[PDB]
Amino acid sequence: GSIKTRRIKVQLVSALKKNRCIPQWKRACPGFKQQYNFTKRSWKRKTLKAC
Amino acid sequence: SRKGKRKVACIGAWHPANVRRTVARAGQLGFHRRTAQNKKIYMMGNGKTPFSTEYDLTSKTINPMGGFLRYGNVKSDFIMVKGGIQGPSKRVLALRKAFAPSNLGKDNEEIVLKFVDASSKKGYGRFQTTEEKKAYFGI
Amino acid sequence: AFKDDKAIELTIPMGKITIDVSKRWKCRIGIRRLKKFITKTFHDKEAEVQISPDLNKFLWERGMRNVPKRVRVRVNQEPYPKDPSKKVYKLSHVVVSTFKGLGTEAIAE
Amino acid sequence: MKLPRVKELSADILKCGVRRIYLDTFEPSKLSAATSRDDIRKLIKDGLIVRKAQKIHSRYHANKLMREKEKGRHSGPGKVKGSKNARMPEKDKWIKRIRDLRNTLKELRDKG
RNA sequence: CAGCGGUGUUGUACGAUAUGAGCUUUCUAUUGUAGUAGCGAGUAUUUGAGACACUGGUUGUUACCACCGUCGU
RNA sequence: GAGCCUCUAGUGGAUGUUUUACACAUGUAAGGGAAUUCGGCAAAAUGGAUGCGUAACUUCGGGAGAAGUAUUGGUUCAAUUG
RNA sequence: GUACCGAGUGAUCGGUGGUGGAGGUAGAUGCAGAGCAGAUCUUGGUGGUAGUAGCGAUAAUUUGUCUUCAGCGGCAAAGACU
RNA sequence: AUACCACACACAAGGGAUCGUUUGGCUCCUGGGACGAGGAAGGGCGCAGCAGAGAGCGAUAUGUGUGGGAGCAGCAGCAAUG
After folding, report:
1. CA-to-C1' distance for A33 and H30, Å?
2. Is the distance from CB of D31 to CB of D47 less than 8 angstroms?
3. Which nucleotides of G are covered by protein (CB under 7 A)?
4. Do the beta carbons of residue B55 and residue B116 sit within 8 Å?
5. Is the CB of A37 less than 7 A from some atom of nucleic acid strand H?
6. b/e sequence D56-85, b meaning 16+ C-beta within 10 Å
7. Annotated binding site for Mg(2+): which residue ranges of B?
8. How far is the CA of A28 from the C1' of H65 (A)?
9. Alpha-carbon distance B53 to D104, whole Å?
10. In whole angstroms, what is the distance from residue B92 CA to residue D62 CA?
11. Most buried by CB count within 10 Å: which residue of A2, C88, D47, D85?
């Protein structure tokens, strides 16, 4: 909801910046072997436990 | 009861371990061949010659007011017989001379008609001819 | 269109064609059966039928559980624009005071 | 600018519900080109977006019934469902009476 | 689909007009006369009316003469 | 601020077919009236307000809305809560 | 690894032709985590049933028109509902 | 058995056994046995030209000195003034 503590807000801000795919240029690099970022999440499928 | 009331409850014992042909089951009803024996001819006549009894001195044809419901007016020769007969209007039937003669007293008696009903078969029919309807109403 | 590019004007017995249809859905199924009547009258089952909004509005006038006894309509026949292998019949509402005397007429233009 | 959104912003501007906004049919291009509240203000001024009137609910029967009940019609034994006391409260009759009588005595004494 | 005949079901359409237990006394012209009304459940007439169906009776109008497959000679 | 009907504000999709039997939610029924069944289970019947009239027993407070009966729409008037 | 053909009572062994693309045996001895049809065995993959059972408690939907490219999507006009 | 069901063989599907390989594991032996109030171990947050995770590093987030010496993995730019 609208009321939040400072500690809860920083957790949300960090959880929101980490939630991104692999940038499209990295895929062209000779040494790079990852397909998809397995740390990506959806609000419909997991809980953060920020509480 | 659960699972329905309009059924036979028990359709057999444990032995024999099959259903017998004598137990009732759901299926086709009607549209079968049937023969009705010893029906008696009350009258024979023609659809467009009027007739009268010794007692009813009106002269009228066999056709009721407005005709028979999904048929209209009789035009050819006709037979009249006692009781009901197989099938709906318009179906074909086969007629046969009786296979053996009857001993029953109800069958072998004479027939003398005094009245035949010619009123409408649609709704309550309350007149025997168009002349009566024209006389009951005005003009 | 029709012979000599005439329109045909006819009356549809909505009361009769819906005799068997359930009270709850009378007006919904009546529309399906008005279109069927047209196609048999001109012997053209695969053709399209198009209902003008004024005729729609007349039919729905007493809600879903009812339909008028008789309705008078003008019909035009044209090749179907989206697939000109078919025909389309276009229906227009004709306002009448009484039905007495109205047969089936063919009118120029 | 999708047409559902045009209705929302118009509803905000004309202080009514979305069910009262009418979009004119002959220039959908002109509507779809809108980007901002100031575009919508102009379209409203030009009459391409219109507020419809309210649906009618007349008091004809209510007034008629009220006048008839004032004449004393209806109101028979087959028209009432509550107790006599619910319809004409007994404590109120008492309170009305005794205030009049007390006021009458007060004036008579004070006037000598 | 309509006429015109025929056979049923319901119960007497809309609108006019007249009456109605009672309650009421308004207007115009102009000095005094003449003009001069309202409100009302219902009932009767026009009206066995009007509505609705079916007709293997009869007249008018409108629509329909295709196409694809299989087996054989 | 019951149920039923409307104003303000908000709302909806597995397609076509008249679609037997057996179901699940419901209606109606001649004459008889619990004969049904472990058992009136289920259903029907009664129902608001106004008046008349109300038993045994009782800790005298109650029983008591006992039971049993009659009235009720529209219109036009009187009379002022009857 | 896969078809054929030969040798052995048998556990098994040998060759030939396609596929594959870099390693492999015969004799005598040594050490063992050394041979499977089953355990309502463990893990992974696949059938029959079957284009079948089902997918539709609730307010309800029709017509035109544009897109969509084939959404009862959007917009107008009706019909309903909380 | 015209078309269903079964088996055999050739071709196409479906799955990942087998054989070939390994910058990982395990066991034994030898060395080592080095933390913190000068703020540890462990947690959080920031820092790249395009940068999510992980690695590296603290607002000095590739600074200074010494020994060397050729490129910075993609794209754009840098480099014997390193």
Report:
1. 40
2. no
3. 60-66, 74-80
4. no
5. yes
6. eeeeeeeeeeeeeeeeeeeeeeeeeeeeee
7. 121
8. 39
9. 103
10. 70
11. C88
Residue holding tokens 């202080």?
A: D15
Residue (of B117, B125, B116, B115) closest to B66 by Cα position = B125
Tokens 């229906």 belong to residue: C91
User: Would you call C9 helix, strand, or coil by DSSP?
Assistant: strand
Closest CA to C49 of C3, C79, C88: C88
Separation CA C76–CA D27 (nearest Å): 30
Give residue for tokens 């005709």. Answer: B67
B72: left (phi over 0), alpha (psi -120 to 50) or beta: left
Angle between helices D3-13 and D37-46 (to 10 degrees): 80
Interatomic CA–C1' length for residue B133 and nucleotide E32, angstroms:
72
By C1' distance from the Cα of B137, the closest nucleotide is E48
What lies within 8 Å, CB to CB, of B130 at 6+ separation is B65
The contacts of residue B123 (CB under 8 Å, 6+ apart) are none
C6, β-bridge pairs: C108
SS (H, E, C) B26-93: CCCCCCCCCCCCCCCEEEEEECCCCECCCCCCCCECCCCCCCECCCECCCCEEEEECCCCCCCCCCCC
Q: Which DSSP category does C3 fall into?
A: G
* Helix residue ranges, H only, C13-87: 14-17, 26-41, 53-59
Long-range residue pairs from C54-58, CB within 8 A, at least 24 positions apart, any chain: C54/C92, C54/C93, C55/C91, C55/C92, C55/C93, C58/C93
Who contacts B15 (Cβ-Cβ below 8 Å, separation ≥6)? none
C-alpha–C-alpha distance, residues D92 and D82, integer Å = 17
Sequence-distant (≥ 6) Cβ neighbours of residue C13 within 8 angstroms: C69, C70
Nearest nucleotide over every DNA/RNA strand to the D28 CA, judged by C1': G75
Q: Is the CB of C64 under 7 A from strand G?
A: yes
Distance CA(B79)–CA(B95), nearest Å, equals 11
